[PDB]
């Protein structure tokens, strides 16, 4: 399937302190693999996936030195934005960044990715061309002009198409056994009767990995639109995920309803119905 690498960076200014809290989180195929946090005893990038333990001390030192540079980049950028928006350092402010690359099943580059947010809102983004910028408002136009003048996009393009791709290739090869592993959902249906001769049927999918999953309900045949209740996919806390899909059915058609579960981990999609105790 497709592959990706992302670094999710956050800097939170701290009233009274010169240095903000800086956090950088790396992901390979939406799974955390590295982390840097400026609030640690001796701040350093640390492995977050078992397959990263094989990286030698020079890798960790090189990444840590980059994070020290980033702390300063974020500190200065937060100070500049405070001026652009006429804000007070008496309050905390948040700067975020997402960057990385996406690859196809053959591992060739599909796209580079670079965006920034200020106070949890889009600020500036690099377009898919990796040459032009989209500023979200008037203040971001100051940054866009500054970056057009310094030719910033060319340096980001070089990283996103080059180093980002080469390192992701290394991570995909090194993390192969972990990255390819799946955990199948275990499904079951529960009965929750209600008013007006109705009963809610809940189809559960538990202990699955990756998080991508589809749950469907049907009365004999044909899928059910909108009337189906669906929770957001949630972590169990052990590396697996959970999800449920429910339907309101008349108190006389329960065994007539079927749920289907679609997940890449399954030998084939699941088919189930409510079972009487």
């Amino acid at each position: 399937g497709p592959h990706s690498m992302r670094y999710f960076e956050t800097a939170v200014s701290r009233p009274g302190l010169e240095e903000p809290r800086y956090i950088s989180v790396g992901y390979v195929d939406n799974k955390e693999f590295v982390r840097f946090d400026s609030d640690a005893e001796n701040p350093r990038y640390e492995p977050r996936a078992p397959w990263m333990e094989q990286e030698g001390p020079e890798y960790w030192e090189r990444e840590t030195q980059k994070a020290k540079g980033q702390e300063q980049w974020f500190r200065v950028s937060l100070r500049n934005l405070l001026g652009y928006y006429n804000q007070s350092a008496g309050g905390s402010h948040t700067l975020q960044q997402m960057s990385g690359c996406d690859l196809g099943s053959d591992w060739r580059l599909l796209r580079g990715y670079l965006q920034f947010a200020y106070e949890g809102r889009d600020y500036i983004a690099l377009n898919e061309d990796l040459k032009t910028w989209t500023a979200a408002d008037m203040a971001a136009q100051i940054t866009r002009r500054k970056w057009e003048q310094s030719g910033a996009a060319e340096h980001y393009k070089a990283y996103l198409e080059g180093e980002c791709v080469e390192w992701l290739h290394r991570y995909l090869k090194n993390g192969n056994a972990t990255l390819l592993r799946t955990d199948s959902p275990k499904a079951h249906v529960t009965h929750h009767p209600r008013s007006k001769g109705e009963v809610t049927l809940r189809c559960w999918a538990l202990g699955f990995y990756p998080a991508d999953i589809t749950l469907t309900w049907q009365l004999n045949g044909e899928e059910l639109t909108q009337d189906m209740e669906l929770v957001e996919t949630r972590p169990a806390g052990d590396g697996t995920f959970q999800k449920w899909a429910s339907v309101v059915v008349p108190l006389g058609k329960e065994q007539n309803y079927t749920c289907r579960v679609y997940h890449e981990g399954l030998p084939e999609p699941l088919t189930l119905r409510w079972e009487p105790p």
């Binding site: 980059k66 934005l81 980001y156």
Partner: peptide, 9 residues
């Protein structure tokens, strides 16, 4: 491997 940003905002 992470990237170092260019010019500040």
């Amino acid at each position: 491997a992470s990237n170092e940003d260019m010019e500040t905002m």
